[PDB]
Design a binder for these strands. Sequence first.
DNA 1: GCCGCGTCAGA
DNA 2: TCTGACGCGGC
DNA 3: ACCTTAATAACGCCAATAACACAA
DNA 4: TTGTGTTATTGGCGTTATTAAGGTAACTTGCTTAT
Lengths: 49, 87, 196, 53, 50, 202, 201, 470
Amino acid sequence: RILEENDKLRKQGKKEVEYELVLMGITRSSLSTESFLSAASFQETTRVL
Amino acid sequence: SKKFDIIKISLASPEVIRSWSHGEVKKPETINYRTFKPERDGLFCAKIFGPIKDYECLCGKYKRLKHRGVVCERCGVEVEQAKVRRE
Amino acid sequence: GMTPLEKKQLLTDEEYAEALENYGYEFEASMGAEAIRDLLADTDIESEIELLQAECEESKSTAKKEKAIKRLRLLETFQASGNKPEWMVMTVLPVLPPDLRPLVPIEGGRFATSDLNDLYRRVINRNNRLKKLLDLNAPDIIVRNEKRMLQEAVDALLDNGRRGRAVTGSNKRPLKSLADMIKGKQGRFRQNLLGK
Amino acid sequence: ITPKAEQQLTPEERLLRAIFNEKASNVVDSSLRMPSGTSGTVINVQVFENDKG
Amino acid sequence: SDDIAGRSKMYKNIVDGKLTMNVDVPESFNVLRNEVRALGIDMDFDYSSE
Amino acid sequence: MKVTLYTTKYCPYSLRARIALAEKKMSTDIVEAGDLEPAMIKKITPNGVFPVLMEKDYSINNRKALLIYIDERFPAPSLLPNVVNERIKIRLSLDKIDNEWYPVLDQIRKHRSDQKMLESMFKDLKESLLAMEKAFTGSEFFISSGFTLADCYIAALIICLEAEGFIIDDEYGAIYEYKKRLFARDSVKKANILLKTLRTHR
Amino acid sequence: MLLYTKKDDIYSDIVRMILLIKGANAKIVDVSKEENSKHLEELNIITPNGNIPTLSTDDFAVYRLSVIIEAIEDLYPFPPMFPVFPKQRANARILLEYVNKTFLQNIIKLQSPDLDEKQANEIKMLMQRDIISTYKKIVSEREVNAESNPDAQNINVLTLIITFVFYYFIKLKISIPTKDKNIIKEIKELLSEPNFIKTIK
Amino acid sequence: LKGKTSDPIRMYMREMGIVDLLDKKGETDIAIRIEEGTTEVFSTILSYPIVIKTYIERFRELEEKAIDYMNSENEPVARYIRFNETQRAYEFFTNLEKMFEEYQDKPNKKLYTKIVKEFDNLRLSTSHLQKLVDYIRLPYARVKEFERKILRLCVERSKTPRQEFIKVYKVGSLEWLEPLTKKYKFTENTIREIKNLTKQINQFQILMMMDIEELKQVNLEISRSEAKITQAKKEMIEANLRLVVSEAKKYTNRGLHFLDIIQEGNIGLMKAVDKFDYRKGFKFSTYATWWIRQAITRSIADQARTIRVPVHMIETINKVNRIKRQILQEKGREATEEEIIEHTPNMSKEKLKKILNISHTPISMESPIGDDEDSTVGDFIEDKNNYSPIEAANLENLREAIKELIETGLTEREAKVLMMRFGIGMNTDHTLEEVGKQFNVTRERIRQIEAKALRKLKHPSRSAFLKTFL
DNA sequence: GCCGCGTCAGA
DNA sequence: TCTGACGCGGC
DNA sequence: ACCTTAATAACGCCAATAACACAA
DNA sequence: TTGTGTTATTGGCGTTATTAAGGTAACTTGCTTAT
Ligand SMILES: [Zn+2]
């Protein structure tokens, strides 16, 4: 939603994106976040680090 | 900014790992047996990691306010607050 | 080398001997961490990225190129960061300030070591004996045994129990290795950072 | 009581030793005292001496 | 709990009776950055302009 | 703990620091600044004044207080006089040696290109040394009772100038009672070059 | 224990402040004053180039304000002008030498009568340029010196030095190119130092 | 088989028992093999002139370090040079010196044979032999140092040829870099440096002999002979790896696990093989177990603990222990230290009061406590060497107190004097003769001023209030 | 391209 | 015990 | 498990020297 | 305020108790340690 809008008017729209929502569990959507600190605190620390 | 506001993680080259090292460990020793003082260049070497008391070398010679930033010469001990044995 | 062998070609001892017989020099097949490190070292990226991206441009990822997708990301990351990929094989490992693995004396005229002191005290004298051996020019069998014992102690220090039958002290407990301090409910994150 | 050493006391401690002629004792006491919030009396005092002496 | 400066600082502010607070950073986090640094991992504070 | 000093070749202050360090009864890694990678050489200090130092948390270069920092950081037997007035005079002597000594080495190095220019300079160097001979006699190393830093200062003008075809001990007038008493020191006997060879050059 | 001086000279008035700090036997004597031609000649006898200032005792005479101030400090254990930690001492030394070379030399230059237009202009430009950096580094140094020992009743000499740099900057009708309220308010508060008044009058 | 099994002990035992056990015949055969290899390298060493003069020179060094003794009724003893040859040694050396003089002057064949035969008379096992082979090697080492150095100095500047090596490589010349005026390497400082190094090169050769090929081949032949000997000893040691493991079954839990035990054994064996001569008809197995046992027990005494302990203190402890068990299983009673000493070579009655005070290996901080409210020892040790926020608040209440107390005393003077003479916000705590100069006067009554200040401060107007802090 | 058999990670 | 995400070997 | 030897760092020494004190 | 008496230290000295090193030549040859 940010990179689409990056292209959306900067170049022309440069054929931004086509996507489709996907459904993932709560733990799966938990570890899959951005901040590596929170994820590393949650569980499975070795792997994320 | 006076306050850090990002945190990053990365691999440590053998040139960073040396840059962190205030010395080098050579013999598997921790502490003298009869008297409990640290040993020369083991795992508690006060010459590397730091002094034990505050503003006082190990051999106890350089013990006075006249000399603070000073580095003793009998033992290689520096002279500074013991609070560096953790960093 | 001109010899028709392949780079990442495992060779048994006798087949290796026969390669030595028929071709002598012009190729080296060493064993041990130096081998892996040399391989990772002489592994050009731009020789490989596009070469694999073209096999992925041959996209039939039903079962085969469902595999080759990750290597793209890995090799791109290693290019993006600026990290020498051979750095994943250590040549000098650091030690921890002593006041994080203390030896304070307590009642009963006794002392309280930390489990890290022991693993350190092991890796050290194993390195020492290794240096002494390499000096004295011993036969290669015991050279191998030392060079392997060392790897074992290093892995134990990092996190024992990942591969073997993790070492124990006299009390027969599996020792509390380095990584075992920053995970688990009793570890470091959800114990003393959200605890207090 | 238990002995100690390594004072190298602060300048101000030095001065105040030097005003009241306060000597610096080398010993420190570590007695045994009932912890706070308790009371009572005594009923038996066992004492065990040294060996070979 | 574990701000070595802040402990004594606040215990002083109280007995005197003024208002101030200094909260630089806890100690357990420095311990963590050490323990992770005792591996080939380089965790560290930094700044950003992008 | 550990401490190393990066140095170049044929420099007065480089040898100055070398002698001072050798005197303090210490142990250091000596690295010749020419054997590093050029980009690495410059990344050491982007400007570049070769004799600097290397400690774990500090790096000092400016060749005016460097020797002072040495004299203070290891107060093992000093390089400055104990009695205050001597301490004051010697530093002004250091100013004499420092503020006006460029033509003594730099000009005879670079500007004197004609052998005629060199020798015409040499006559003035000789006569200036002779004019200086009407000075200190019998003093231990300088105005002093014991060994001082200026002692370790003149050794550079000794060695580097010996390296410029100016051997002058008796063809130098009456400054010989110490100029020979100088090299009776262990530390100063690091200027330049069977069992002795194998034993010593290690 | 005598100090030859010369009005309208940053060096002499700097050492005058340093002396008034101790309030020592400031047996002050000028040079350009015709009431002491004989003693001016005397100075010229006891020094090669008649540099001012110059400290004289019954034991020696000195010049080169670095040596001057350091000898004063060797001489008076009065509330001092230096740190206690060798690293900080060396850093103070180097910064002093830097600001000296970069500013006081140019000040001595534009103190000349035979100046030019372009020269005075470019010099004042560089001074207005670098004053800010000098001040910032100096206050930084002050802070870090102080953290390692509080309530030490010890004065940092480089602050006085920068005070006199600013004071002469005022006394020669030049602009200070800043816009910070903090910068200027701390400047003015600095200039209002009590024992500093003792001489500027 | 190579079947993913991780634990190394098997991956070592497998290869260990591969090659066959041998008989006395094979043992003595490989022994005479190593012996003739050593005699080859020995004989081929001393066929060069400078060797014996350097030998004599080292004897001269021992001569002066011997004369350094009467400065403090024999020739001063030091025979760390030769093993099992001092009057005979010295006299033989005198003959060596004089005959070697005549050798370096006159002859061609005869006296060289004479000196090699009188060397055949001598006896040196492995130390001094290696001393001599280094006597030869180290010169080649240093000259190769200088070669590598001159290369690194010139080759990465002098147009970076790196492949015209055959033209430049002519050594000991100092006649090639002058055309380099019309070539690259604008390297004047480097020019005088490489000339210095080549000077030293020719000087070393002058000390020794003609050009590098006078020593390169010597070192080559030495390498060859030494490789023969090395292969012989390797075959020898590889034949009895099982002896190590067999003996290392007793010491198995005394503090060290098995692998390092085995390694220490193999060290003590490899050190044993080369000092065992076939000249006596015996069994290698007999003599080698001595060295195996020495190595294993030494390593055990060394690294069996965290708090290291000297080895004599450990064997004495073992002796005490054996005595204690002997008496316990004989008279029922336990200690009766009177008996422990009543028959003992310890020959002390106080060391025992200390030899067993170090008898507790440190507990480990991570031992749970069974039920015991479910904790561990590693959370009952506490910080003891710091200042608890109360121990560091009753200080500033004093650090600032007197800083005001004095501000109601002297006008200014006694304040200055107490600060300078006690040290408060100062850097040194100056001495009487320093304040004596601070005020230009009063070298002595400065003490009077401080006495007055102190007598002025001990007044209940100012005294009893502070009296708390002590 | 898949029917069973592993390791890891939390309970 | 499990529950699965994720495998990576027989066919 | 037992020696037989160099080698090292703690411990006692009495003078020197820099510093402090105490009567007029 | 200047003379004559301590003292507190401080590098030198020797002393030796303590630690580290090395060497024996009757023949001796492959655990797996346990819900
Ligand atoms: Zn010390």
